[PDB]
Amino acid sequence: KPSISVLGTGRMGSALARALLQAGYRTVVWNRTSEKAEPLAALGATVAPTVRQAIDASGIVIVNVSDYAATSTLLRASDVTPGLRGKLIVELTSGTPEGARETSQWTAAHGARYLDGAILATPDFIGTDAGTILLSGALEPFAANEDVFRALGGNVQHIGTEPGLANALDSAVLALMWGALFGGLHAIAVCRAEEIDLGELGRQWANTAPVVEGLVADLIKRTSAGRFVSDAETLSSISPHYGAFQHLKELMEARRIDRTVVDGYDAIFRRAIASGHLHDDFAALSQFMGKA
Amino acid sequence: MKPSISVLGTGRMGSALARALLQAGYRTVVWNRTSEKAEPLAALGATVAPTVRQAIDASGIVIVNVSDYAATSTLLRASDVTPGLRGKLIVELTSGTPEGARETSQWTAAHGARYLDGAILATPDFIGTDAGTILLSGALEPFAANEDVFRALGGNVQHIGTEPGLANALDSAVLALMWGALFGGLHAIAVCRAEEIDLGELGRQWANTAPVVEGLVADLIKRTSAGRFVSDAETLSSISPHYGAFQHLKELMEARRIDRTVVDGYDAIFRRAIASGHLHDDFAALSQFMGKAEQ
Ligand SMILES: NC(=O)c1ccc[n+]([C@@H]2O[C@H](COP(=O)([O-])OP(=O)(O)OC[C@H]3O[C@@H](n4cnc5c(N)ncnc54)[C@H](OP(=O)(O)O)[C@@H]3O)[C@@H](O)[C@H]2O)c1
Ligand SMILES: NC(=O)c1ccc[n+]([C@@H]2O[C@H](COP(=O)([O-])OP(=O)(O)OC[C@H]3O[C@@H](n4cnc5c(N)ncnc54)[C@H](OP(=O)(O)O)[C@@H]3O)[C@@H](O)[C@H]2O)c1
Numbered sequence: 001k002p003s004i005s006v007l008g009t010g011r012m013g014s015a016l017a018r019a020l021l022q023a024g025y026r027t028v029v030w031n032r033t034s035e036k037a038e039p040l041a042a043l044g045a046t047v048a049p050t051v052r053q054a055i056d057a058s059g060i061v062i063v064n065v066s067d068y069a070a071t072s073t074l075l076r077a078s079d080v081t082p083g084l085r086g087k088l089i090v091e092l093t094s095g096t097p098e099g100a101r102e103t104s105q106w107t108a109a110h111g112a113r114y115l116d117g118a119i120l121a122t123p124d125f126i127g128t129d130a131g132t133i134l135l136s137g138a139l140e141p142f143a144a145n146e147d148v149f150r151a152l153g154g155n156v157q158h159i160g161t162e163p164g165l166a167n168a169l170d171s172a173v174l175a176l177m178w179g180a181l182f183g184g185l186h187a188i189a190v191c192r193a194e195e196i197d198l199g200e201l202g203r204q205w206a207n208t209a210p211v212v213e214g215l216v217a218d219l220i221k222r223t224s225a226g227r228f229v230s231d232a233e234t235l236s237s238i239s240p241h242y243g244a245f246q247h248l249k250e251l252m253e254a255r256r257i258d259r260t261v262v263d264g265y266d267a268i269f270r271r272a273i274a275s276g277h278l279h280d281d282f283a284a285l286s287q288f289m290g291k292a
Numbered sequence: 293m294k295p296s297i298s299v300l301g302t303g304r305m306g307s308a309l310a311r312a313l314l315q316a317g318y319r320t321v322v323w324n325r326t327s328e329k330a331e332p333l334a335a336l337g338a339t340v341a342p343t344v345r346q347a348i349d350a351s352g353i354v355i356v357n358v359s360d361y362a363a364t365s366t367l368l369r370a371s372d373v374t375p376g377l378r379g380k381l382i383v384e385l386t387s388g389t390p391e392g393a394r395e396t397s398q399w400t401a402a403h404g405a406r407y408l409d410g411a412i413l414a415t416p417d418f419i420g421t422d423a424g425t426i427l428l429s430g431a432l433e434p435f436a437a438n439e440d441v442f443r444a445l446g447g448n449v450q451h452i453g454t455e456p457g458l459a460n461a462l463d464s465a466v467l468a469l470m471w472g473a474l475f476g477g478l479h480a481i482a483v484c485r486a487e488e489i490d491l492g493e494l495g496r497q498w499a500n501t502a503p504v505v506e507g508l509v510a511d512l513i514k515r516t517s518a519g520r521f522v523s524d525a526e527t528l529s530s531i532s533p534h535y536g537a538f539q540h541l542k543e544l545m546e547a548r549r550i551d552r553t554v555v556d557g558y559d560a561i562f563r564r565a566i567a568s569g570h571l572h573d574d575f576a577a578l579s580q581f582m583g584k585a586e587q
Contacts, residue, residue, distance in 0.1 A: 188516045
């Protein structure tokens with residue numbers, strides 16, 4: 001089994017390193033702040049002191065830093081670049097499809113194979129069967145080294161050959177996540193302003209989460225089939241949503257909780273109603289997301 | 293199956309409550325502004341009152357389930373009804389605001405009635421099932437004295453405190469979580485359409501990652517309850533990498549002419565947290581910046 005290098009030992013870079021070690025890979029790590037990489041030494045990692053050293057130790061280089069601008073400062077420096085020849089670079093950093101494409105062109109021009117990924121996981125999911133990572137780029141590199149990706153999670157998937165696909169789907173899945181989390185921020189604010197124990201909110205969310213998961217799956221299934229008009233299988237219709245949402249708005253007004261996000265919800269509800277969708281399926285709101 | 297229960301409102305949800313009281317063997321008295329809508333409950337064993345005042349006089353417990361609190365007011369504050377509320381337990385299960393709950397608590401007490409305010413977190417189908425969820429707030433004694441009645445409405449009926457507005461507030465909060473996930477869905481769909489991604493693919497990715505999102509939300513609630521805004525060893529994610537990736541979604545929505553009213557809201561909260569030193573704190577730190585930037 002070949003040696004794997006990991007550039008970045010933040011929360012997520014460390015989790016990747018831990019999973020490689022658990023699977024019995026010689027794992028070489030590097031981090032701008034060397035102090036943060038020590039605990040992986042304790043676990044069996046070799047700590048490289050320099051990028052160039054980490055790149056020379058291994059045939060596969062998994063990058064997990066803040067952004068592609070950072071990855072550039074690391075890999076595009078004169079004293080690293082010549083070391084990339086013959087290597088597989090796996091950019092698991094978050095980015096834009098353009099960034100994936102720009103990095104694909106550049107890595108190829110300097111003699112290295114490339115995969116661009118997006119980790120659809122928190123660190124606790126890495127190295128578990130449920131662990132999801134999306135990979136895009138040439139198929140051969142993923143097929144030749146499949147056991148390495150299998151170490152990272154049971155649901156690491158090659159989803160296409162155009163490098164930017166992982167980053168594109170990622171932005172969509174992150175939009176879902178941000179939606180749920182800022183709804184959390186709204187709920188937490190409402191409970192704090194109304195003197196509601198947040199441990200109670202946490203019990204209420206554990207009870208309703210599975211229903212809300214179904215409401216979101218149904219919204220996607222219906223939008224894919226154009227089924228915007230309410231029917232017998234409708235779970236969620238615009239009228240009752242819009243009606244109850246008035247109560248949340250009134251509460252947030254009274255407690256001076258910021259309404260910029262909910263006023264956003266309200267503008268989408270109102271465009272759909274102004275177009276006769278008041279008793280249509282929630283999925284009809286998918287027609288009213290555009291700028292103008 | 294001992295005391296008599298009246299239900300005002302036989303709409304979709306009012307009916308389900310009445311059906312569940314009958315299933316449990318309660319003498320059930322119903323009334324509806326549209327008489328015709330209450331007939332099917334007669335066939336099931338309900339006595340149909342012709343007037344509100346008659347429905348209120350028949351029973352010691354009055355469950356109200358109408359459209360809005362303005363409606364409840366019309367019904368209960370009428371000269372011919374009000375004096376009949378003396379010694380009654382009124383259980384307002386209509387959806388409303390915490391202020392509405394509070395205004396009704398004050399008023400009901402002034403006219404000599406005990407009060408509970410509720411919010412139903414269930415569709416009519418799940419009323420009278422073990423899963424059936426209803427939140428109640430107000431004085432505890434009335435709930436504890438009549439607990440078998442609430443058990444009839446569902447297995448997961450809960451008294452959550454003494455301040456009457458808690459039920460309506462917790463309801464709005466649970467729905468804010470739901471709306472957050474759904475409008476996130478609307479955003480994700482829109483991004484897929486603009487990038488020519490099969491929505492069947494988004495649907496498979498959601499089945500794969502829903503638990504990751506569910507854990508992020510649970511963790512955000514647990515940490516906010518303990519004030520843990522500083523990033524630590526147990527942190528799942530922190531503000532800097534969130535704000536970094538969120539830049540890519542903003543740029544994409546600009547380029548594909550997707551409406552940004554909602555994400556610009558996210559962006560203002562990210563900015564206030566960073567301006568106050570939380571760039572590398574836990575996501576939970578954003579919870580400190582949900583207040584109106586005003587005054
Ligand atoms: N955490 C999650 O749940 C999650 C989910 C999926 C994807 N991701 C993505 O994975 C990446 C890592 O996130 P994380 O949670 O691990 O964040 P983090 O804990 O803040 O880790 C940041 C990492 O980037 C490095 N870095 C920052 N600026 C750099 C620069 N100019 N040059 C070199 N290295 C630099 C840090 O080095 P120092 O330690 O030297 O500062 C560290 O290795 C991000 O793109 C994130 O969006 C995160
Ligand atoms: N359906 C659900 O799944 C669900 C779930 C949770 C919460 N809820 C809440 O339950 C409550 C009842 O809604 P629903 O689903 O039963 O709605 P619905 O089917 O529209 O029933 C509306 C009811 O309100 C009555 N009403 C409205 N205005 C009135 C007035 N001014 N005077 C007298 N009666 C009046 C109606 O009388 P008419 O029959 O004469 O119009 C009818 O009984 C709402 O607050 C709703 O938010 C419903």
